[PDB]
Each structure stands twice: as C-alpha cells, then as structure tokens.
Amino acid sequence: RRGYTYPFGDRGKARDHLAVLDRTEFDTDVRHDAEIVERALVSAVILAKMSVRETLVTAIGQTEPIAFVHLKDTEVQRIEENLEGVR
C-alpha cells in the first residue's frame, strides 16, 4: 500500500514488484514458507533500493541480495545477534 503511492520514476517495474508483493500468501504447508518469504523479500528490497535509487544488480542469472536498507549499523548487528540466538 505504501509502495503504490511513492513517486517512482518508472512505474512499470515498480508495479510488477507491487503485484508480486500483493499476491503473496501462505498455503499452510509448513515446508513452503521459506521460498514465499524469499520471493516477497527480494521484491520488497528491490522496491526500497529503487526508492533510495541506489544501484541494483542487473547481471543475468543473478538476483538482488537480501539486506537491510539504510538501517543503523548498531541496530543491524543487534538484529543479527537476535537471529543467531534464534538459530
């Protein structure tokens, strides 16, 4: 919903990523969660990168890595510590 209203320079690819985001849902198969999450996350990160208009990967056979955008470094490492604790 927030990505719809952003004044993107190129509405086309933005609308594609908005579509893939809004289609997402879970089918209650406990094994299918991870790939759905990864798809949603890569689309969202693409949108955020376009909004900040930082560069994004374009090489064929390759996809944008999942990472936080402009997040404070200390909070990033704290989140990594929490995820390690979960692991």
Partner: peptide, 10 residues
C-alpha cells in the same frame, strides 16, 4: 529530501 525531489520531477 529525495522523496520531495521525486514528487517534483513527477
């Protein structure tokens, strides 16, 4: 802010 610049350009 960059968001304002993008809105202006649009």
């Amino acid at each position: 802010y960059e968001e304002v610049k993008a809105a202006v350009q649009q």
